[PDB]
Design a protein around this ligand. Structure first.
Ligand code: F9F
Ligand code: F9F
Ligand code: 0JO
Ligand code: 0JO
Ligand code: NA
Ligand code: NA
Lengths: 268, 395, 395, 268
């Protein structure tokens, strides 16, 4: 399918950036997670980044660590996540869905089989957080064989060779890392570095989404102004879940408010 | 692109977030340069000799082999400054950190011996040291916490996961992914992403080089086997490396069997896990059916790790080295035996290697065999743990 | 009648109950014989090298002398098996015990390093070991109690008197006076009745012999001074002996000043006591006006002793060696400084010697001086004590 | 004076051995100690061995260690002991009085001065427990200069050279050690070794008193039968003091009973 390509063309026509929330699948339980995701979409999410709970998430700070732990406490498994993804796609035929994976979950019972399952449930992209381009060959091959976009990372410390590889190997979107470190809303990244955005464009890379430390509408606007195609926010969203565990109604209301405000900021 | 091979057969690699690849490439280049720099080699040799106390003794056991055809030597890394082999490669990595213009050190520690080594090297060489240690290990290896703090290191307890070595490793790597501009990650075992398995081996290989020279001097021939405990794999690869091309010499690595392999409470992934990707490497690991990383278990904090260094996985795969396991109770018996019959208090990690050598002797007492055990550390850190167990046991 | 001179000037002798004189004469004869026996010397050398880890390093301090004209080396007896210099002479005395057909060992211990040494040597050489230790020292040097017990030694707390080293010495001697037929008294310092001050010096003198060779190798000349803490006097006489005839080399012994000489709570009889007869010798001791032996005090159990070996009293009297004191607080500062600036955790005993060297440097920072401190032991035994103090201090 | 010589001649004529109790001066206090000593004499003690409290009594087991400690708790000093000795001699002009000393108390403010003080108060002998014959020269010289008998020890492990020296250097009595070890009633020594008794007699040594572990009348009889001139008992006496601290009357009664029984056994 061409879900990211279609989205970016539509946003381009509307002179809008994408706003893309991240949540952990099954946090704080399967049923509440599905409701959270529906709320995110209804509130204006242009795409989704969805985490499969993993025991040792080494690119994640405490907020998303704790999201993984909540999902595990609810007994969430990768198999249950794939059931959820199928249900989400059934409801929402065009929204791009990207997974945030750790390598072992992809490698576990065969890389090819993993990407085949992604295709079956209608996932559009997979970002394997601990597989750099240097190690990516079997992952990107399996991805492309199964009509999945493999997502690669452009860090602030990117050199020309990396820029060219990311442009060549990646599909769907390019991840433009705000900063070094791990996920977290307290650690605010820099403005998208224009040098990287304009090099990615030169090399015909997939459109750039800025991620890490994006927690405010101001930052989404700033990403758009800097030439990024959109922005991802995870920890900021997850904090609203964490804060409202005993108040599922308030949780959804506050998620709606936040997502709507972040989306509003993407409009130029 | 790398200067050296990141793989040992199928095992190894550089499975880190993209952010960290420049740091790993920089470290590899610095290592390659240093290895052919006579000034670096002289500085490292000087520290090993005059600060750490190399070469370490090779001690012939006088009592524990009585009435058998086993001759058993112990390579005395317990006599190295700091109390364990960990000191060797820390001195080399600290010099690399300075070669690279880094002012801070991050380290993980389980037994606290790598932590003590990182702290002492940082104190000597003028680096600011922070150490991650699982909260369970802070308790069961408490003497080393005291030592690290007295030497001015920051010790950060890790309560996540199993609150043991893998959790300390996780936090160290998370930290480094944000702090690499100013901090060197002084990884303490022969595992993790390239180039660490290579660097750690090369900075530990004097163990086996000295052993070879000493055993030749004393026996006029090579050992029938060299035996070493295996957590991440540093002391064992350090003992093994110089013998790899001596095909007659057995290389035996001893993983922790914990409460018994059948209980699932062990740290023996090389032989009882399956290949996965975690902590920057493709290596055997203890994992669930779904590919979640399992928590390990050992009485010994230094061996309480659910993976193993990629070079060991490779040496096993080709049949050059053999890997076995030893349970908590077997290790405890070896600890007691060495204390009471040789007057050496070994680390509980090292006690696993000794326990296997004792089994090799006891099972076949008329087999002529010349064995070396790598006595990777002293057991001062363990004496309170072992006391509490032998007491609750009614001894 | 004796084969060797029991006196050093006015100091020394054999002031024991008549019952014990045959045992002392037997020991002297065995020592004299052993000293000229190539087989004994070879056995002793082999144990020192291959079991204990001699020679020990001589480490140049890289940081603590910055901005001064002092060059400071540390003789690393902290790296000897067991963690202190005490191991050297225990191996020699244990061999003597076997030369003499004795099956049991009695030892006293304060810091527990001599106790650990006696236990480890007994385990190695097949002797049954009992150790007297003051009850106060059982608490403040607890890691060594655990070590002694794990190695199969019997540790007997002494509650009499000050419950410290002198009280352990008393009980050991009382025991020996009944058990000498089968037990060797392995006295752990250069004090007590002849021939112990002589034997202990001769079995510790490799410290200074190695130091001389090492400093010549590294500096091309002898030290301006060698500096050692002084309890009973073994580590200091071991460092001093080979330099006695090198008249240019200062010999500086450091007694514990405790809370301050003026408080009377110290262990500095050489300089602040007067001659008396106790523990089998005529020597300076801390005593009341009426001639009762006073209780000593030091933060360090190994220096908490109200007398001193007779050879030190003699070397002082003729002006060959100079003796000074260092307070608890001065020793604590030296401990912290070495931990944080050289990455070495010293025994609190050894910290007294280092503190004096630091004063020699700090008081006269433009004085050119080449100094060696005997770093008599490691501080693992002390880490809990030092922690508790620095905590109560608000650090 | 010739108090020991006179006593032994008298005992010889009566075909009796000597019974000689030991106590610590000032245990459990000065006044009670003086009463104890009077009781010992009234009950038949032929001579006294009296300890001056010392901080570190290395030839003594726990019983006499504790006697020293009691005296110190009562503030007893060597000066007070000498006052006591003067009072004892004033009451009892002929009984031989021997002191049990440790070297430091003799050496403390001059060996000569110590023996001069002994003479002034009318002490007859001094046994310095931690000075062997090999180290004895200044002690025995000062003793003889001040008309004090220096007492030397014949251990069971005595060789011929020691026997000859002890016979030559000693006066008053020769101490015949029952056994190795330290003082104590629980540790029973052997019968006086006849070889040593008969060698001492051959070398014209002062008459032998057997000491260490003598706690029963049977042992006193056995010492006499073996050719010793008498027997010393310390710990057995001191135990009666220890047992009866709260009952000073019973203490004296039990001391009298015990001493009388021990003395009765000395009669042949
Ligand atoms: O808003 P924040 O700071 O929580 O960031 C949320 C990011 N969530 S995500 O799935 O895009 C994401 C993307 C990349 C990650 O690691 C990698 F860069 F190494 F690949 C981890 C998470
Ligand atoms: O009855 P016991 O067992 O208490 O023995 C009492 C002995 N009291 S004493 O003063 O004769 C006495 C005699 C000699 C002593 O030591 C020495 F032999 F080394 F000199 C100690 C005490
Ligand atoms: C986990 C630690 N040490 C492990 C260790 C080990 C196991 O680690 P290697 O497999 O890397 O040698 C062996 N022996 C000793 C004395 C050890 O301290 C640590 O000190 O951090
Ligand atoms: C009292 C003891 N040790 C004393 C000691 C001393 C003081 O004892 P000498 O004066 O005999 O060296 C010095 N250094 C160390 C490390 C010591 O352990 C003992 O271990 O029994
Ligand atoms: Na392992
Ligand atoms: Na002293």
């Amino acid at each position: 399918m061409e879900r990211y390509e279609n989205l970016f063309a539509q946003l381009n026509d509307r002179r809008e950036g994408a706003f893309v929330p991240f949540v952990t699948l099954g946090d704080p339980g399967i049923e509440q997670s599905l409701k959270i995701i529906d709320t995110l979409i209804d509130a204006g999410a242009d795409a989704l980044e969805l985490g499969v709970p993993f025991s040792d998430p080494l690119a994640d700070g405490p907020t998303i660590q704790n999201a993984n732990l909540r999902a595990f406490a609810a007994g969430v498994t990768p198999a249950q996540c794939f059931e959820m993804l199928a249900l989400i796609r059934e409801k929402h035929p065009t929204i791009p869905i990207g997974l945030l994976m750790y390598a072992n979950l992809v490698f576990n019972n065969g890389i090819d089989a993993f990407y085949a399952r992604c295709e079956q449930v209608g996932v559009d992209s997979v970002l394997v957080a601990d597989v750099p381009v240097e190690e990516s060959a079997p992952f990107r091959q399996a991805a492309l064989r199964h009509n999945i976009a493999p997502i690669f990372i452009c860090p602030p410390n990117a050199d020309d060779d990396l820029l060219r590889q990311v442009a060549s190997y990646g599909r769907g979107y390019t991840y433009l890392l705000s900063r070094s470190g791990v996920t977290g809303a307290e650690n605010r990244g820099a403005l998208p570095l224009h040098h990287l955005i304009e090099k990615l464009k030169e090399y015909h890379a997939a459109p750039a989404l800025q991620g890490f430390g994006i927690s405010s509408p101001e930052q989404v606007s700033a990403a758009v102004r800097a030439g990024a195609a959109g922005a991802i926010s995870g920890s900021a969203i997850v904090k609203i879940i964490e804060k409202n565990l005993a108040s599922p109604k308030q949780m959804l209301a506050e998620l709606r408010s936040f997502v709507s405000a972040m989306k509003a900021a993407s409009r130029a | 692109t790398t200067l050296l091979n990141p793989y040992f057969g199928e095992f190894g690699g550089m499975y880190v977030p993209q952010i960290l690849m420049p740091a790993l490439n920089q470290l590899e280049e610095a290592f390659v340069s240093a290895q052919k720099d006579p000034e670096f080699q002289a500085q490292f040799a000087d520290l090993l000799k005059n600060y750490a106390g190399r070469p370490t003794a090779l001690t012939k056991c006088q009592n524990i082999t009585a009435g058998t055809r086993t001759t058993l030597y112990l390579k005395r890394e317990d006599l190295l400054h700091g109390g364990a082999h960990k000191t060797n490669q820390v001195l080399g990595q600290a010099l690399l950190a300075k070669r690279m213009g880094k002012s801070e050190i991050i380290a993980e520690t389980g037994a606290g011996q790598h932590g003590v080594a990182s702290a002492l090297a940082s104190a000597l060489l003028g680096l600011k040291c922070r150490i991650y240690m699982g909260a369970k290990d802070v308790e069961r290896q408490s003497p080393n916490v005291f030592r690290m703090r007295l030497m001015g290191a920051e010790v950060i307890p890790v309560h996540s996961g199993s609150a043991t070595l893998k959790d300390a490793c996780n936090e160290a790597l998370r930290d480094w992914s944000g702090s690499y501009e100013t901090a060197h990650y002084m990884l303490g075992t022969a595992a993790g992403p390239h180039p660490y398995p290579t660097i750690v081996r090369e900075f530990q290989r004097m163990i086996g080089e000295e052993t070879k020279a000493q055993i030749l001097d004393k026996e006029g021939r090579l050992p029938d086997a060299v035996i070493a405990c295996v957590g991440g794999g540093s002391n064992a690869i350090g003992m093994f490396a110089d013998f790899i091309n001596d095909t007659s010499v057995g290389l035996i690595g001893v993983e922790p069997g914990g409460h018994g392999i059948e209980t699932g409470e062990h740290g023996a992934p090389l032989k009882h896990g399956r290949v996965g990707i975690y902590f920057g490497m493709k290596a055997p690991m203890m994992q669930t059916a779904d590919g979640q990383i399992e928590e390990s278990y050992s009485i010994s904090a230094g061996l309480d790790f659910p993976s193993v260094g990629p070079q060991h996985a490779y040496l096993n795969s080709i049949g050059r080295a053999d890997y076995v396991s030893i349970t908590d109770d077997e290790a405890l018996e070896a600890f007691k035996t060495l204390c009471r019959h040789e007057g050496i208090i070994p680390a509980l990690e090292s006690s696993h290697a000794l326990a296997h050598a004792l089994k090799m002797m006891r099972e076949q007492p008329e087999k002529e065999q010349l064995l070396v055990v790598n006595l990777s550390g002293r057991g001062d850190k363990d004496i309170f743990t072992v006391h509490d167990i032998l007491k609750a046991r009614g001894e």
